[PDB]
Each structure stands twice: as C-alpha cells, then as structure tokens.
Amino acid sequence: LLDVQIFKDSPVVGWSGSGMGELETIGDTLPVDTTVTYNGLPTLRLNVQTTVQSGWWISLLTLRGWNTHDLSQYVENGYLEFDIKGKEGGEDFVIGFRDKVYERVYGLEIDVTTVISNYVTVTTDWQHVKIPLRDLMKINNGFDPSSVTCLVFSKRYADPFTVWFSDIKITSE
Amino acid sequence: LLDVQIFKDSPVVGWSGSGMGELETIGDTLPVDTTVTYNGLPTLRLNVQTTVQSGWWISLLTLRGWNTHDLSQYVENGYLEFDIKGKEGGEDFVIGFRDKVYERVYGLEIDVTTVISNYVTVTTDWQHVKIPLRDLMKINNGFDPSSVTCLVFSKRYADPFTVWFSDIKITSED
Amino acid sequence: RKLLDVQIFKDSPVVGWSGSGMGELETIGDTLPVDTTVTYNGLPTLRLNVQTTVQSGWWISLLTLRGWNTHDLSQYVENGYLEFDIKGKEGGEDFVIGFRDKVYERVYGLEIDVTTVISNYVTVTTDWQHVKIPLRDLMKINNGFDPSSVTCLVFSKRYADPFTVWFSDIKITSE
Amino acid sequence: LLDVQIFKDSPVVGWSGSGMGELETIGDTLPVDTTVTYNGLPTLRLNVQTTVQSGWWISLLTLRGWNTHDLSQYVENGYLEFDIKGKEGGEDFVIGFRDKVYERVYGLEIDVTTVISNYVTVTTDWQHVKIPLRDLMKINNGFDPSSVTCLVFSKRYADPFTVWFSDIKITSE
C-alpha cells in the first residue's frame, strides 16, 4: 500500500501566514529553499523572521489541493514522516492535520496536533522523523481521518526560528 | 493505454477570445511561442495584456476539432497533465473541460473547472503538473465525459498576466 | 532638374511608428518588422501583418521619410508615383495607404493624412505584383495637405480583418 | 565574408536618450546631419547639449531592428570601424555592443564597452578608426556575440560635447 507525498521538491498549494507578517511566505505558501538542498532535492523553509506578540501564525500544506483525502486506512499503523534540519537547534511548534465535515456542527474543519518536540530534539542537522498516525488521529474530538484536507504547522511559543524540510509524506504498510 | 495530446508543438483548432480584445490571440487561437522553447518544443502562450473590466476571456483548445471524444475510461485514474512557466509568478485562472449533449436541456455544453492555483503555485519556472480527472469530472452537474469537446481556460481574477505551456496531454493507464 | 528617386524602404528597417489597439499589429520596437526569410529580387521585404482581429478598431503604420522630418515633395505631385511591389498571404487583402504632413500655422489640423484604399490600385495575389500610385490623385482634395511638408507614408486599418502582406522597394518616382 | 552596416546614410532604429533630455535626439534616435557631409554621404551626430548632472545618457543603434544577429564568426579578427570628427577635440565616451540571452540569469541584455579615447584622441578632423572585436567581446563577463542586438554609446565624463560619424560598419575576414 501507497505513499503520499505532502512535499517533495516544489511549493505546495496552500496557505501559510501570520498576524503582522512574521512568517516568511511567498504567495502565501511556504518559501521553497534551493540554496540549501538535501538528497539532491531542495527543501521546504519554515521561517518565522521576528518575535510574534500577535501570538499567531499558521501553515496549511494541502494534500489534494483543498480536497479531502480518505486516510482512514493509514491510521492504525501509519506515519507522517520526513526530514528536518534547523537554524540553531532546540526549536519547537505544532504539527498536524485538519479535516472537513459539513455535517458536524461544533466544528467544520478540526485540527489534530502535536508538538514536534515529542518526536524530536532539533539539531543543526538533518534527521529523519516519523510520527505514528495512531496517536493524533485518536482523541474523540471528532476528527474524521477519512476527510483530511491538510497538514498543519502552527505557533507554539512566540519565538522566531527557522527550520527546513524534505520529503514530507505519509506511509503505512 | 493511450495518450491524448491536446497540444504539442503547433497551434490548436479552437477558439479563444476576450471582451475588449484583452486576450492575446492569433486568428482566434492562442499564439504559439517559438522564441521561448521548452525541451526542444515551442510552447503555447496564454497571455492577457491589460486589465479586463469586461470581466471576460476564454480559451477553448479542442480535442477533436470540435468533435466529441469519449473519455469515460480515462476518468477513473486519469490526469490532464502539462508544464508551465509564468511571466512574473503566482498567476491564476480557470481550467477544465466542456462537453456537448443534445438531448440534455438545461445545458448544451457544460464546463467543468478548477482554478489552477489548487494544483500549483506558479514560478518564473518550469514545473510539471497533473490534474486528477476524477476530481473534476465528478460533481453530478451533468457533465458527460464520453462527450468532451475540449479544454478550457477562462478568467478568474481580472488581472493581467502571461503564462506558458508544454506538452498538454491527457494520460491514464490500463 | 531631370529627377531623383525617394526610397521609403529598400532593405533595412524604417524609423517610424506603427502600433495598434490591443497589439494586433506585428511590431518590433514599433516599426514594422523586416522579413529575412521571404526575400524578393535579392532584397528583403517589409512585413505588414495583423495577426488577429481588430476589436479595437485601429491600427496604423507610419513609415517616415526623413526621420520625421518635413520633406518637400511639391515638385513630384503632378507627375509623381508612389510605387513598389506587393505579395500577400492569401489574396484580396485591403487597407489604407498614404501620407501624413506637418504644418504649424494651420489650426484645424497639424498633421494631416491623404489616403487611398490600395484596392483601387490593385487586387492582391499570392504573388508579386508591382504597382504605381499617382501622387496627383491623393495630394489633391482641398483638405489642406501641404505636399511640401510631408513627414511620412502611412498604412492604416480599413476592415477589421486579419491578414499579412509584403513589400519591396517602396519609393516615390516622377520625371 | 560580408560587411555589416550599422549606419550609412539614414537614421537608425533604436533608442538613445538622456536624463533631463541633455542628449540631442529626435524620435528617440540620433539625428542625421545633412549640412555636415563626409564623402558624399551625411553623418550621424552624437551631440550632448548641456552638462549632465542626472549622470546618464545612452544610445543604442540596432543592428537588425532589435533582432539578434550572430557575430561569433567575426570576433577573432573583427573590427567595429568608422570615421569621426568632433566639435572641438579631445572628447570621450563609451562605445560597444549589447546582446540578449533569455536563459541567462544575472543579466538579460549585457554590454561590452570601451572608451574611444583608447583607439583615438579626437580632432576637429576626420579620422578613420578600427576597433578589434577581439578586445571587447572577450572578458568572461558572459557576453554572447552570437546574439548581439546593438551598438552602444553611453556617458563617460559628464561634459557636454558633440561628434559626427560616418560609415559605421563591422568588417572582418
């Protein structure tokens, strides 16, 4: 059973943005870094220039251009997984998926998230990582894994950093 | 199972035009550019000179010189696919398919459409792309994919822009 | 006297101006493009092309005589001939042809044009075809033209409709 | 192998123009002088009325009405050559060629130049001059002389002057 590329090599359909413009966007997706490859392949840049006392920013990297995908199959042994290096290490924010169900009243798209921290400490260095779907996609808050629309990156602490990405995908077995 | 080239290297039969003539044509097809290669072959130029308060332009690039093609088999697993460079980045517009059915009343040809944004951010740069058929060819709004007449490019925002294309095909596999 | 030619074009691009509403006219640096790959009698041609259909309802071409300067033609008038050679893409193709002047004194118009429809002087073939335009005919309807103050030759829209066409050796002659 | 006339006897298409209009133009090319002939034919006059404190002006005399010309063959024993008198001697500016290559990143059109002082001092007098293509079309600055678009004259010293030209061609082999 089949992989899904969130990002490979060329910027993602989505939306990515901030209070007073603290997060570095291009056409409101994340900026794609060329000057800093990895694995032949270029990177995704996650950069928050200065200090948000807005206290917000967000990144939505879609899966099927704002369409729902069913992942339900993937869940119970699945992995968001990818690679990350960082600009000066020990850097943190949130991560996850939103979906979309119109039937549901108390929430249209919901998010399920965690803090990267839980899966990694960050080095000045490349480093694979794999989060079991399992954990997230299971907190009876309603989230319908049949119905995911995208991957998400949100603020944790207000402090500026950077990070880079490669080869963000979902896989199972 | 077999490709369909919508365009390769030389101008399409079709139609393409604007309100006040805002869309660049030649003889009512899109102009093909030569001084602007890509991968050996020249490319199709989608350009809209100035700002439409008209609020309209369109291109239809035909599939079978205005005939019906049956695509039904391809739907299920298919991809309009193609490559695309742009003048100045982050441009956008609508794209899709029109068909033709006569027995049908509340519509003669229908359009099915998405806004390419969904499928790409645009760069000063080549960049392949692939649209799931499947995606479009399915909202019970009547479209008959066994009766597609051609592909379509229409206005989204009133904003001037240019773009290019190469190798526009449909492909599947069975 | 015993009298000399004027070479409007021969074989290299003319200073001037030529342009159109939504860019329907084939320009380069707003003169008309000179074609290389369709020669005629050794020398290169001038290309008049209107790629698609004029919604705008204008297009013009100014080929200058003296880089926008007055030239005095007055003497050529009553015996003269704008003349030159013409192939088209697809035949029976038509538009306006003529001359613009420049007179400062004159208040109801600064520059004026005198004009004909080449139809009158030709039907157009997928083929080369000399033709002679009698100065005479134009440079005379009382409309004020100062043929002693011509600045350039002129091509303007007649019909909405798309074509191409070629030129060579556009000159004035008399005797 | 065959001569390239940049100018002979009749105005050229291009462009030439100045900051606050210091540069004598007409229709935004250089004026042809008629009342100052030189061996039958009239001349091209590069005249700069007043003192430039904008600090720019330029002239481009096209070769193929802003088309690419391929010169490549001519370089390695070629000479831009022409003739030239000046209004009151020892006058100096830059001269050379521009190109156009689209694929190229760090410049679209580039220029190669020199200062004509190097191939002459200027007389109230007619005086042929021959400039070695070689010299120019030759500092790995990227110039691609298979795609020359035109000849160029630009400012060197802010000081007004005039000159005249005659029979500007490329010759070689």
Number of neighbouring beta carbons within 10 Å of residue C110: 11
CB-based contact B27 C52, cutoff 8 Å: yes
Q: How far is A87 from chain B (nearest CA, A)?
A: 26
- Give me the count of residues in chain B: 174
Distance CA B90, CA D53 (A): 40
Touching subunits for chain A (3+ Cβ pairs under 8 A): B
CA distances from B35 to A167, B164, C163 (A): 36, 12, 22
Residue of C nearest to D12 (CA): C15
Q: Are B17 and B23 in contact (CB under 8 A)?
A: yes
Q: Tell me which residue of C66, C71, C64 sits closest to C16, measured CA to CA.
A: C64
Structure's resolution in angstroms: 3.5
Distance CA D86, CA D102 (A): 38
Residue of C nearest to B49 (CA): C22
Of C21, C22, C52, the CB nearest to B28: C52
DSSP states along B53-89: SS--EEEEEESSTT--B--HHHHTT-EEEEE--BSSS
Q: Are B167 and B37 in contact (CB under 8 A)?
A: no
Q: Outline where DSSP puts E strands in D53-105.
A: 57-62, 79-86, 94-98
In chain D, residues 61-80 whose CB comes closer than 8 Å to chain C:
62, 64-67
Counting beta carbons within 10 angstroms of the beta carbon of residue A66, is it exposed (0 to 12), middle (13 to 18) or buried (19 or more)? middle
- Cα dihedral sign for C154, C158, C159, C160? positive
> Which residues neighbour A39 within 8 Å (Cβ) at sequence distance 6 or greater?
A83, A166, A167
Burial C84-100 (b: 16+ CB within 10 A, else e): bbbbbeeeebbbbbbbb
Distance CA C142, CA D15 (A): 37
CB-based contact D66 C29, cutoff 8 Å: yes
Q: Tell me which residue of C95, C109, C94, C96 sits closest to C146, measured CA to CA.
A: C109
Counting beta carbons within 10 angstroms of the beta carbon of residue A165, is it exposed (0 to 12), middle (13 to 18) or buried (19 or more)? buried
- C110: Cα separation from own chain's centroid: 19
Topology at the third CATH level for domain B1-174: Jelly Rolls (2.60.120)
> Which residues neighbour A40 within 8 Å (Cβ) at sequence distance 6 or greater?
none
Touching subunits for chain D (3+ Cβ pairs under 8 A): C
DSSP states along A19-74: SSS-S--BTTBPPEESSS-SSSS-EEEEE--S--SS--EEEEEESSTT--B--TTT
Alpha helices, DSSP H only, in chain C?
Answer: 135-138
Domain ranges in chain C?
1-175
Q: What is the rounded end-to-end Cα distance, in angstroms, of chain A?
A: 6
- Cα dihedral sign for A59, A65, A66, A68? negative
Host H or E run for residue A165: strand A162-171
Distance CA B42, CA D82 (A): 40
Tell me C70's DSSP state.
-
CATH superfamily of D1-173: Galactose-binding lectin (2.60.120.430)
CATH for the C1-175 domain, from 2.60.120.430, 3.40.430.10, 1.10.1060.10, 1.10.1840.10: 2.60.120.430
Residue of C nearest to D34 (CA): C66
Of C9, C12, C68, which to mutate for an interface test with D (greatest number of D Cβ within 10 Å)? C12
Of D5, D64, D65, the CB nearest to C31: D65
Touching subunits for chain C (3+ Cβ pairs under 8 A): B, D
- Give me the count of residues in chain D: 173
Number of neighbouring beta carbons within 10 Å of residue A76: 13
Tell me the chain B residues in contact with residue A29 when contact means C-beta distances shorter than 8 Å: 121
